[PDB]
Amino acid sequence: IAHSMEAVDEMFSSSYITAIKNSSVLEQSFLRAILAEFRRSGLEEATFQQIYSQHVALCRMEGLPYPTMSETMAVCSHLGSCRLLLVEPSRNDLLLRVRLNVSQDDVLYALKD
Amino acid sequence: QTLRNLLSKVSPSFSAELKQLNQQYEKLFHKWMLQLHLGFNIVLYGLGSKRDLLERFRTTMLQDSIHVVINGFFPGISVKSVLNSITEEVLDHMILDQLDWIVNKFKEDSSLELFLLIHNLDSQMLRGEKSQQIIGQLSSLHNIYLIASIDHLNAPLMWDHAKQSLFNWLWYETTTYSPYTEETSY
Amino acid sequence: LSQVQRILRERFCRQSPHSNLFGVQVQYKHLSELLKRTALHGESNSVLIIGPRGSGKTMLINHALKELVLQVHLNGLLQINDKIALKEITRQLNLENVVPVIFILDEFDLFAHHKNQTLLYNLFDISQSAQTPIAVIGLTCRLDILELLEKRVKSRFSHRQIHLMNSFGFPQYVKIFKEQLSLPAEFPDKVFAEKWNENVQYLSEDRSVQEVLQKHFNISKNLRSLHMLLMLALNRVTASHPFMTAVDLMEASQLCSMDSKANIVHGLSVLEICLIIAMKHLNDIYEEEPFNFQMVYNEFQKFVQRKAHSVYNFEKPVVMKAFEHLQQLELIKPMREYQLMKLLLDNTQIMNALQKYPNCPTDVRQWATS
Amino acid sequence: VVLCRESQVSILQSLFGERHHFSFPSIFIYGHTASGKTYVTQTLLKTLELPHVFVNCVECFTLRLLLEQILNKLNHLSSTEITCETFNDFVRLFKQVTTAENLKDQTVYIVLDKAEYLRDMEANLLPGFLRLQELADRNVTVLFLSEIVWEKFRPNTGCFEPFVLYFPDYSIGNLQKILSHDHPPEYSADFYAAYINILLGVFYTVCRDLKELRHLAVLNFPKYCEPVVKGEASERDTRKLWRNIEPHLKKAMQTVYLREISSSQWEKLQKDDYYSKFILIAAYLASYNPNHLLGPKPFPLDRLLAILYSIVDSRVAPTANIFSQITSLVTLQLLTLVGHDDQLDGPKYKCTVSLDFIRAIARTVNFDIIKYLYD
Amino acid sequence: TSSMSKGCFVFPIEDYFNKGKNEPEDSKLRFETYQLIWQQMKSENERLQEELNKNLFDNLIEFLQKSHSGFQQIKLREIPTAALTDHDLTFGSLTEALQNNVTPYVVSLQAKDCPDMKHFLQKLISQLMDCCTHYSMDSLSSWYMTVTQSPPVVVILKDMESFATKVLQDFIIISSQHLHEFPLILIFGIATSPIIIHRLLPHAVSSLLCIELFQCKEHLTTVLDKLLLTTQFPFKINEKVLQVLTNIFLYHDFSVQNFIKGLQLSLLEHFYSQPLSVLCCNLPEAKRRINFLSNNQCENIRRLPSFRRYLENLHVYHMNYFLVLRCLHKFTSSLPKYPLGRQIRELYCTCLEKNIWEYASVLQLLRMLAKDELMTILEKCFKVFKSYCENHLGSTAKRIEEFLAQFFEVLRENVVNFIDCLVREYLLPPETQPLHEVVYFSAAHALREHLNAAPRIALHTALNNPYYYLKNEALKSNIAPDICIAYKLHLINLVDWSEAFATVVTAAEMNEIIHARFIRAVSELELLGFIKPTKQKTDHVARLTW
DNA sequence: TATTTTCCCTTGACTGACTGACTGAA
DNA sequence: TTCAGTCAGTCAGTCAAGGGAAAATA
Ligand SMILES: Nc1ncnc2c1ncn2[C@@H]1O[C@H](COP(=O)(O)OP(=O)(O)OP(O)(O)=S)[C@@H](O)[C@H]1O
Ligand SMILES: Nc1ncnc2c1ncn2[C@@H]1O[C@H](COP(=O)(O)OP(=O)(O)OP(O)(O)=S)[C@@H](O)[C@H]1O
Ligand SMILES: [Mg+2]
Ligand SMILES: [Mg+2]
């Protein structure tokens, strides 16, 4: 029964949660900043500026060094390339709408551990 | 609508008073042709409808000539139709390219003479500037003659200095009181 | 020496195969076992390897193929149309004259963007039904590869998934860094090889090196970035500098993480800086609402007439030209006058960039602060 | 020759290493307009005598032109015609053509400039060029030249990240040293240095572009030698020349800098030492009234006629000529109708003219616009 | 016959020209003379236009010469460009100006067939091949090297304002990079303010181009000096006709076409209404027509009011009057204030209005003039005298020669006396001499109403005061056709308007036909550009407001 | 090159809150 | 002469249709 259970939960389950778990530190901070901004506002779309400000605040809270805009843009591009978000960052830069590609409860369940 | 069209038993109050003006302005037909043959075109602006005057003019004068009439008041006319009538039936041939071909044809031969009658030039179907450009290039030729009429208060806005430079316009105050019975579609 | 430089250039830049593998024991074992099954036997299978870019997806296949007949490699960028793919397949299989085989599909996700996914559907059908043994493995960066496919092609798609994540901690990253910058045992000069290994050993525990490693670990665990870092660091080694030093790694780390927007702003001129300060003021007063050239020009005129010196009395054409120049670098995007312009910068970035500006006067600084 | 460029040059030369060595697949250079991304790399690749193919993205507006020009230049450097249609065919032909002896164990470079257009050509072309060393596997390096930072070249899917590089911002000393080198042999180097110094002091505030600045210097030089030719001033009269030349440069800043006056006319000069107006004024006054910041607004013909009658204290009969004259202006782009609901019934017009032109027009016929424009 | 559910139904010259039984033969002589005169007019006008266009093209050719002088290590060389219905022929002439002089290779392009760079280059290379496959600028350079083995290429963009901005930018950018290997020259056609250029070509792109600008009242002054101020042409006009023509030209539109049109309309009306227009021709033809005249023609000559008061004498009067007026214009234009007038038009108007002797106001400045002005004016007068031969004023030329050769106050006073005696001696109003009305026409209302008619004024007159053309005492301070009743009642919901119209039409007198008349009036009003139905009331529209 | 569909931006009337002139102090 | 309560006259927020150029298809 163990073999069948492993097969069924390895070939059917979604891999978003463990992909979030294995993500880097700055990526986790970016996710936390987006979640906090959404809690403040309640909308499913937000520009890059508010998320960047929330991320600066969270980095100051964590004691991390001051992050530049280009580094945040690179992190966002990497996150988009794996479709964890939805964005069109090719041409517009500071005014990018960012949407969660998965449910918020899954993100919280991944980030609680 | 039909009930109104059927009822036409009314009679004008001043009968002979209006009748005399008809001849008063009919006396100008010879002057009209005198002007028109020498490189001008004639426009009618007045309160009453000129269709009666146009009919009398075509009966009295437009008999021994090649003439084509445009009923611009019809709600379904466009310049393509008049171009088709010119090329297919007036000419024995069997829209910009068509206009170029017609201009070239009349440039080739000066033996063809046409009288272009336009009952209404300011109708909603011919208020476009490009259509007026086409008609101006047509009537700019010395082998086409133009009699036209305008009734809109804001009519002259339709053409500009270049377009009015194309038409060698001549004006004629003809203030009849004829009703617009045929023109009004109700 | 030239030999070690050539060896490392071949190691990092070309990403040539290497014997040492990191945290992929189970995945590579399974992949090579399946390849052996599909080679020694007639069974056909289909596998997708999903991972973030630069995580060494290519290496697994490139090494398990060596663990093992014709192979076909298809990249989504070269063949964009089904006719091109058919031409390449016919030419590579040496059956062009006529008209088990291994299919390798790089950039698999793009193949889901075709008009009918005909190539993928046919490959799935022949894998599932045809007696000829065919093995198909695709490379994937998107985590939603299961939703870009049609229902039927998904039905025939065997759900064999490999996940290449960077599931290793910081001390393991330290071990990886130590091992990656080590000469092998095949080098001609052996005493220098041992001394080089001793030097990299010593560099391993230097805490200023640990600063660089922690920083670039927070940025990106992707090994491609680390290889780029090592190559850039190695570029600063010649005969006069026989060994690498922690200061070199600090220099490389700083050179890898400099912001471009601040540099561009540092590249601007006086009038551009003044216009940007006026732009920041207008954006502050009008919270997140657009503007045009006239309001900015009036604000600038007010500043120069009232607070600034009588010098810098510039007309309208020069300010319009400066606005055109700023629009040319795509720092200002429309939503020519009376046009709803907007800004593409952050306030603190402008402040920091002005902090480094060489010849910034004092009145302009006060205006920026005020 | 390259001046004040020794950091990036040495970095690049170290990057190349040896001919049989391997290098980066993609290096992305970025900077400002005249930063030097083109002269430096061209002089470097000419000095090193390496196989490099120079390509302009503006000229090759089509993919086929780009690939065929690349292939023809490469074949000409190696040494009839090669024509390819897709990227895959170009890759195959490149693998076929690089097998020459002289192109066997050397790095072949594909220099691109004005690459800002590559993002607007096709979706997959840029990733194809980024991963060229993987696909061709023939010791290939490709450079990128741009004025936009790499942040705006990133596709959504992500690709092979090039190594980013910045060419440095210039300075007063660097700019003068670049300028103070190509001196006219007919006068002193100190004279040229002083000329560059005063030119920078006048113009560096806004016009930092080295190309524009050198063009301005070339244009402005002949006026500067007149004081010493006529003998009224000596070569040591710094203050005298400054006073003589400063207003001339200040005026050239207003005129030549915007190129309102053609250079030929500039050099020649220095060597030689009715009812339409009222309709337009009424239109303008009606447009800017119920801020000048928010822009004009459309107005109907009724108010235009009313304003025109009110302004003119004379009997202006509403003839057809004035009606046609109104619409004779909209064809000069000085007006614009909006809505196109009807062509004759109440044509609303919007007046797209500047204030200075209106003021000059009013000055022509002795009328004041200002007194009617504040409310 | 002409009414159905379809919109297109189709059903000697002198006989039309002459309708009165007065004289047909004199009528057909008048018509031929009129046609000959107008042919001469048109020929001379064409000569003037040709001369002006050649004058412009000379300057353009010289500009191109100086531009290509530069083409004869790049050191920042730019692209030479020159900014410049009838236009179709205009540039056509330019072609013959350029092909015969500058280069054998010149092409024209139409914005209708240049949507992208590909079509632009394809058409350009096709035209280049005619003037003798994914082409490029390298293809152009290779072709140029093949054919020339120095002459540049000229491209005519006859409607630059209609091109695509991207195509222009790309073409200029790619062209500037190959000036060393492929010469290019551009000629833009512009019929608007040149500032539009800066709104299409960005300054970054525009920095690559060296632009030159190349091009109304002067035209009219010159043509009127060569039409009416010349003695050769026999027919002339009176004061008011000229005043109306000028006051429409320099007030309504700076167009000379309608001025020439008014000239020919005046000529036609004068030759149509007046039989004695047969009388006036060139002097030999005039006399030979004089010799044989019908009795009724002699009757008409006998009844002329100018004759009741009382040709060669009038003609010599004109030939001396025009020279004296030219001298007066030379005098007036010399003054810095220009009191009498700026152009010859105002000089002739003020000389013809009345006996000029502000006249003393101008003489006041005349009294305080310097010596060099006198010398220059005398030299100009002498060259004017030498310009025209067959002079009846040779003795005056000798006198002014004596005046000038002597070269304080008395001499200037004497020469002022000489010129004042001249202007008193020759210039006069024309109607003072008899038999003027043969040559002259004046029906100001006819021409003025024909050329610049007023539709709105006529409509308002018809709709407000029907008595103006219906002479039955219908108005002197209600009893009018219902059209006027409705229009006046407008200056308005339909129910109240209909009730008021019904009560008014009953006061002026089963009656259901009043409703029918109301409907007809409303419909005919709607057909005119007056009203449009609204929803605030049953209908409330006031487009007129006048 | 010709034909058919979609939501964004313009016009307009319905609706509910707002505030200028008035009064009285200080 | 500017700052507190009143009211009448004012003013902006709010709920719908439809034109029309971009988008899609042949
Ligand atoms: N498990 C591993 N064992 C050994 N080297 C690894 C491992 N994972 C990554 N690498 C290194 O990662 C380097 C870069 O990997 P790449 O081959 O460029 O990535 P990739 O597999 O091609 O992925 P993409 O998305 O196709 S670009 C190689 O030089 C390897 O040495
Ligand atoms: N760093 C430099 N050192 C010396 N001369 C330079 C330098 N940069 C520019 N120049 C000179 O200026 C000219 C024009 O500058 P470019 O080299 O074209 O600058 P660029 O970075 O290529 O910008 P673009 O793409 O040409 S607009 C060159 O031809 C050189 O003569
Ligand atoms: Mg790979
Ligand atoms: Mg360059």
Residue numbers in the entry:
A (entry chain A): 748 to 860
B (entry chain B): 270 to 363, 369 to 460
C (entry chain D): 17 to 84, 94 to 124, 153 to 388, 397 to 431
D (entry chain E): 7 to 85, 92 to 285, 304 to 320, 349 to 433
E (entry chain C): 3 to 13, 25 to 85, 94 to 105, 112 to 159, 177 to 193, 212 to 277, 281 to 375, 402 to 448, ...
From the article:
A second assembly contains a fully loaded hSH bound to the ORC. The engagement of the N terminus of ORC6 with ORC4 is seen in the human complex only, and not in yMO. Also consolidated by other human-specific interactions, this ORC6–ORC4 contact collapses the structure in a folded configuration in which recruitment of a second hSH is sterically impeded. To mark the structural differences with yMO, we refer to the human MCM–ORC complex as hMO*. Because of how the N- and C-terminal cyclin boxes are arranged in ORC6, the human MCM and ORC do not recapitulate the exact same architecture seen in yMO. The hMO* structure could however transition from the collapsed state described here to a more open configuration similar to yMO, although we did not observe such a structure. The ORC1 IDR is critical for ORC6-dependent loading but is not required for hMO* formation, and could have a role in this hMO* rearrangement, creating the space for ORC-mediated recruitment of a second hSH.
Eukaryotic DNA replication begins with the loading of the MCM replicative DNA helicase as a head-to-head double hexamer at origins of DNA replication. Our current understanding of how the double hexamer is assembled by the origin recognition complex (ORC), CDC6 and CDT1 comes mostly from budding yeast. Here we characterize human double hexamer (hDH) loading using biochemical reconstitution and cryo-electron microscopy with purified proteins. Although both yeast and humans use the ORC, CDC6 and CDT1 to load an MCM double hexamer around double stranded DNA, our work shows that there are clear differences in how the two organisms accomplish this feat.
